[PDB]
Design an enzyme around this catalytic site. Structure first.
Site, PDB file in Angstrom:
ATOM      1  N   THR A 244      41.531  51.745  49.337  1.00 50.88           N
ATOM      2  CA  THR A 244      41.701  52.141  50.735  1.00 50.88           C
ATOM      3  C   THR A 244      43.171  52.116  51.125  1.00 50.88           C
ATOM      4  OG1 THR A 244      39.510  51.342  51.291  1.00 50.88           O
ATOM      5  CG2 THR A 244      41.069  51.556  53.096  1.00 50.88           C
ATOM      6  N   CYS A 245      43.879  51.077  50.695  1.00 48.49           N
ATOM      7  CA  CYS A 245      45.287  50.938  51.042  1.00 48.49           C
ATOM      8  C   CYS A 245      46.091  52.147  50.602  1.00 48.49           C
ATOM      9  CB  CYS A 245      45.826  49.668  50.387  1.00 48.49           C
ATOM     10  SG  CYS A 245      44.875  48.181  50.823  1.00 48.49           S
TER      11      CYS A 245
END
Lengths: 168, 167
Positions: free
Chosen positions: B58-59
């Site tokens: 996600t990052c």
């Protein structure tokens, strides 16, 4: 615990976390981690397991892994079946580190010793990082195991030390 | 202490980072120094984003890339500096910035060593920072929010920050 000695069995039930190489060097693809059964992989053939204090840090990158990459052909000619680089960095960071070094295939695998569990179990971890060490294994038995404690040195864990062991 | 709008940004907040040299070559490691975040944030408009991990799904694939895609809009909204922090060390953070094509101060990539800052505001977990965003203007917090839903950037993503800035 006493450090691993030549003639010792490689420890049982050692598992790392890693993202197997897909062939793409695209650093913006995070990937999917799985586990790697290191004890089973090391049970047959000749293996070189190298631990580094940190992916992307100066000695680890600019001297240690680059030395191994430069002499991959010599390692293969010396009979090495697999080269494994471990660190406490997670599998995503380790995968990126391998891609940054141009490694698209299994020539070197880049894996995480999660929480330094394996390195701690053999006495060679420090405060959340593994030590800098190399272990050469043949058919489940340690041939060589040594740790570098001098800052910036790869005297004991570098590719030349490993090639010397294999030639003897 | 949970930070909230109206609070002063905390004092003595220091991160570890490699100032960008212009390199986009991940095989050169760099020299870390400290970054005085409390001082930088005392003037102008700052966006501080924490991510659980450099290079994680996600990052990387949603959070930092959303900010990069809309840097023009952040500039036009008056943002003077964007900081991305995580518990990863400064070498990993520098590599992560370079992997995303950032070679200058448009976004800085810094380490919240040992989650010191993130823990002090209640938004760290087991050696990683939370996923959160703090908007600061002249030393005062105007927005501070954490995403707790897996994979979500609803509260800490660039669109939330741009909405904050437009209101």
């Amino acid at each position: 615990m006493a450090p691993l000695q030549p003639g010792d069995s490689f420890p049982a039930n050692v598992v790392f976390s890693y993202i197997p190489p897909t062939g793409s060097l695209d650093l913006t693809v995070s990937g999917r981690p799985i586990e790697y059964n290191a004890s089973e992989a090391l049970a047959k053939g000749t293996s070189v397991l190298v631990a580094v204090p940190g992916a992307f840090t100066p000695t680890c990158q600019e001297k240690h892994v680059t030395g191994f990459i430069a002499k991959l052909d010599q390692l293969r000619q010396a009979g090495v079946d697999r080269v494994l680089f471990i660190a406490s960095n997670d599998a995503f960071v380790m995968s990126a580190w391998g891609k940054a070094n141009g490694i698209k295939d299994e020539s070197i695998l880049f894996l995480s010793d999660s929480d330094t569990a394996f390195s701690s179990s053999i006495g060679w971890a420090n405060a959340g990082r593994t030590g800098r060490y190399a272990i050469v294994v043949k058919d489940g038995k340690v041939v060589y195991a040594a740790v570098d404690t001098v800052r910036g040195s790869t005297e004991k864990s570098g590719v030349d030390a490993v090639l010397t062991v294999l030639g003897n």
